[PDB]
């Protein structure tokens, strides 16, 4: 539903979806090759599957192709200023690709609508629902249109017949705390196969040791994991898979 949700919200709006309490496979998100840009700013694209986050946040919207280049911390514009923002400390990857033949309509579908003028600049990963008519000319606009009085937003026509920029490019942005909170989202953790009666290094759930793995009779308590011995020598192990 981050990527595969059919109809994303328009650009003035967006959805902050917390992603936590799960394991996050970035590989297919990395390996799908259906995404125009897989764009990481402060993290390693292939090391995601190895990297674990407490927080993750996905924000899914629609921008002009030429605006795809505009999103990057340090890169301002009509976007970063008004409709939606970038953190200047922003760290995380960015994934953009076109929805064109899906989201575009031959009539220049006016759902996707970008903020025209709201003077301020949003805070990182924030919006404003303001419909208030912008005031350019110092003469009071009275919350309506008039001389130098602008609707705060502006509505993209997306035609499938548009040039590159003016087609819709769905952009979902990621987020995280990394560690420093109780960790929830991690990348998948790749188990190997098993070998018995052959001296092997091994790792189990993070337990690391080396020995001769063998089947044993002794029974555990279902919540218990390791074994030990008198000498605190990690001994039995319950096979996690």
């Amino acid at each position: 539903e981050v990527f595969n949700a059919t109809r994303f919200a328009s650009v003035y709006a967006w959805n902050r979806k917390r992603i936590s309490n799960c394991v996050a496979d970035y590989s297919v998100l990395y390996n799908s090759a259906s995404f125009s840009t897989f764009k990481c700013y402060g993290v390693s694209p292939t090391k995601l599957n190895d990297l674990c986050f407490t927080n993750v946040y996905a924000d899914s919207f629609v921008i002009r192709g030429d605006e795809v280049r505009q999103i990057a911390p340090g890169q301002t514009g009509k976007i970063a200023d008004y409709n939606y923002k970038l953190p200047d400390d922003f760290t995380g990857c960015v994934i953009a690709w076109n929805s064109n033949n899906l989201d575009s309509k031959v009539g220049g579908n006016y759902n996707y609508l970008y903020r025209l003028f709201r003077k301020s600049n949003l805070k990182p990963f924030e919006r404003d629902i303001s419909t208030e008519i912008y005031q350019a000319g110092s003469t009071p606009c009275n919350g309506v249109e008039g001389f130098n009085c602008y609707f705060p937003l502006q509505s993209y026509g997306f035609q499938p017949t548009n040039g590159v920029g003016y087609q819709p490019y769905r952009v979902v942005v990621l987020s995280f705390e990394l560690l420093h909170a109780p960790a929830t989202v991690c990348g998948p953790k790749k188990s190997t196969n098993l070998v018995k009666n052959k001296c092997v290094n091994f790792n189990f759930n993070g337990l690391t040791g080396t020995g001769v793995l063998t089947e044993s009779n002794k029974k555990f308590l279902p919540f218990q994991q390791f074994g030990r011995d008198i000498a605190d020598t990690t001994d039995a192990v319950r096979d996690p898979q």
Partner: antibody
Framework: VKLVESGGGLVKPGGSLRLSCAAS????????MSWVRQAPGKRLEWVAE????????YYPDTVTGRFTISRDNAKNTLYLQMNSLRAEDTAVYYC?????????????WGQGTLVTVSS | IVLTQSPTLSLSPGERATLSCRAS??????????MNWFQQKPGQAPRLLIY???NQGSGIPSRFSGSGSGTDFSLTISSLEPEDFAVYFC?????????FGQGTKVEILK
């Protein structure tokens, strides 16, 4: 800027008439492309299509022109391979090129593809 | 949908050419600006004119001008020239294959 097309051809009704639209002076990907017909004694009929960053290739549905459309973006060449040929297909075909997004357009045009299907 | 145009005019040099692009069913745009203008010269490939009737610019000479209201689109070409007149067109948008106009050509006497 400039749309070069395939030359004339004369076939019988019912077959598949291939064409090619050679692009000179623009990026063929950045522009959704098309094949539009000006038929003898007729209005311009927008017929064949392809989009820029995707594959569109819709027609007037009606009786589908059905003409096979593909792209070689190395050649920058749009193809019109006209399925269900008929005598009415006699016309001057224009592979056209659109503008960047808006209320239109078709900016430039082919020089026309003379096409005659008859006995 | 389907549209109709002013088929022809017969006029003199240095005059306005009022060309109505009359759209059946859909009228212009929800975003208030649509249809188009196009020109195909006799013995010549078609050529862009205006889009949303209010618009385009350089590359389309200043004589080309006009607007449209709902169905009808008025292509107003001021100061006609006997060398400059040729069949004109207007594309639909927002519904149906965008098609074109039935063709529009302003004759010029003298």
């Amino acid at each position: 800027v400039k749309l070069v097309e395939s030359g004339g051809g004369l076939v019988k009704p019912g077959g598949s008439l291939r064409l090619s639209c050679a692009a000179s002076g623009f990026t063929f990907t950045n522009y959704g492309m098309s094949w539009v017909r000006q038929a003898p004694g007729k209005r311009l009929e927008w017929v064949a299509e392809i989009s820029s960053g995707g594959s569109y290739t819709y027609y007037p549905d009606t009786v589908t022109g059905r003409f096979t459309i593909s792209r070689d973006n190395a050649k920058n060449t749009l193809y019109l391979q006209m399925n269900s040929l008929r005598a009415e297909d006699t016309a001057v075909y224009y592979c056209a090129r659109f503008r960047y997004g808006g209320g239109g357009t078709v900016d430039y045009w082919g020089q026309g593809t003379l096409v005659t299907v008859s006995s | 949908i389907v549209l109709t145009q002013s088929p022809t005019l017969s006029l003199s040099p240095g005059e306005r050419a009022t060309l109505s692009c009359r759209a059946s069913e859909s009228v212009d745009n929800y975003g208030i600006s649509f249809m188009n203008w196009f020109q195909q010269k006799p013995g010549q490939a078609p050529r862009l004119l205006i889009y949303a009737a209010s618009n385009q610019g350089s590359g389309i000479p200043s004589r080309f001008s006009g607007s449209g209201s709902g169905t009808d689109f008025s292509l107003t070409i001021s100061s006609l020239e006997p060398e400059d007149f040729a069949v004109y067109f207007c594309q639909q948008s927002k519904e149906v294959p965008r098609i074109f106009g039935q063709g529009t050509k302003v004759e010029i006497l003298k």
